[PDB]
């Protein structure tokens, strides 16, 4: 039936792979879901301003 041991286990992304063996880690990397979050690194500020507004009030 297969095992659940492929690092990206319980991963939020949905990977559609191909595997011939019992262990899921032997499976290919396959197609994945495309999600992003430029903010966690670009705008990790507590308060948000917006372009139209002046950064420092």
């Amino acid at each position: 039936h297969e095992n659940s041991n492929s690092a990206t286990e319980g991963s939020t992304i949905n990977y559609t792979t191909i595997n011939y063996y019992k262990d899921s880690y032997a499976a290919t990397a396959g197609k994945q879901s495309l999600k992003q979050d430029p903010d966690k690194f670009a705008n990790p500020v507590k308060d948000i301003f917006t372009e139209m507004a002046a950064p420092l009030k």
Partner: protein, 236 residues
């Protein structure tokens, strides 16, 4: 209503009148450990206020020639306050920090200080000493700021929780960082989750006559402190 601000933790309070807002490390607030992420079977100690408070430690003097300095959080605080004790008595440690690097001047001064956080801050040189890897209080100084003494370009450090102290605008920076490690807990006596770097990108300058004593102080505060594995008191 964006420059003024106040930080209140434990029995300490910080003030500012030229702040440039607060940055949250990777957009995440310091949280405790889940009952599934932890493997340490024993209810840890969350002293809170007694350790989760503001600690003003070291201070340095900015000059027209200063290269830069750095610290190693996990270790830095140890040996001081109630926090240090738990860190020395317990084996496992866990906590996030609120850093506040203040440095004021007059409207006639000019300068730009980059204050960023760097996880797992390892250094090179063929092996640096214990006095260089864990310079707790009073930190250490950078010799080759361009490569951060690690062989990496500083021009690419903004890719981490950072902030600037441009004397012509603000006079202090503030960062908040959650616990960071491939583990739930870890002894801070021998491992530093990260380090703080303060480097002048724009050389401090000012016409003669204006008070040349421009100090830069460091004040931090633990958050969601959790300690486990209570044992004998250790130092390193």
């Amino acid at each position: 209503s964006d420059r003024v601000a106040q930080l209140t933790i434990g029995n300490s309070t910080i003030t500012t009148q030229e702040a440039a807002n607060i940055i949250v490390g990777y957009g995440e607030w310091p949280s405790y450990c889940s009952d599934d992420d932890a493997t340490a079977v024993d209810k840890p100690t969350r002293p809170d206020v007694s350790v989760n408070r503001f600690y003003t430690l070291d201070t340095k003097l900015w000059e027209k020639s200063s290269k830069g300095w750095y610290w190693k959080f996990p270790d830095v605080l140890t040996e001081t306050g109630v926090f240090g004790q738990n860190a020395q008595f317990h084996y496992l440690y866990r906590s996030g920090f609120c850093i506040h690097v203040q440095c004021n001047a007059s409207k006639f001064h000019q300068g730009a200080l980059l204050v960023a956080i760097l996880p797992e801050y390892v250094i090179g040189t063929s092996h640096p000493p214990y006095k260089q890897t864990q310079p707790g209080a009073d930190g250490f100084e950078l010799q080759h700021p361009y490569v951060l003494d690690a062989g990496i370009p500083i021009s690419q450090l903004t890719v981490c929780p950072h902030q600037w102290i441009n004397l012509r605008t603000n006079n202090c920076a503030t960062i908040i960082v959650p616990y960071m490690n491939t583990l739930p807990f870890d002894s801070a006596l021998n491992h530093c989750n990260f380090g703080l770097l303060v480097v002048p990108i724009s050389p401090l300058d000012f016409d003669q006559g204006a008070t040349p004593v421009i100090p830069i102080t460091i004040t931090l505060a633990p958050m969601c402190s959790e300690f486990a594995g209570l044992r004998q008191a250790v130092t390193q």
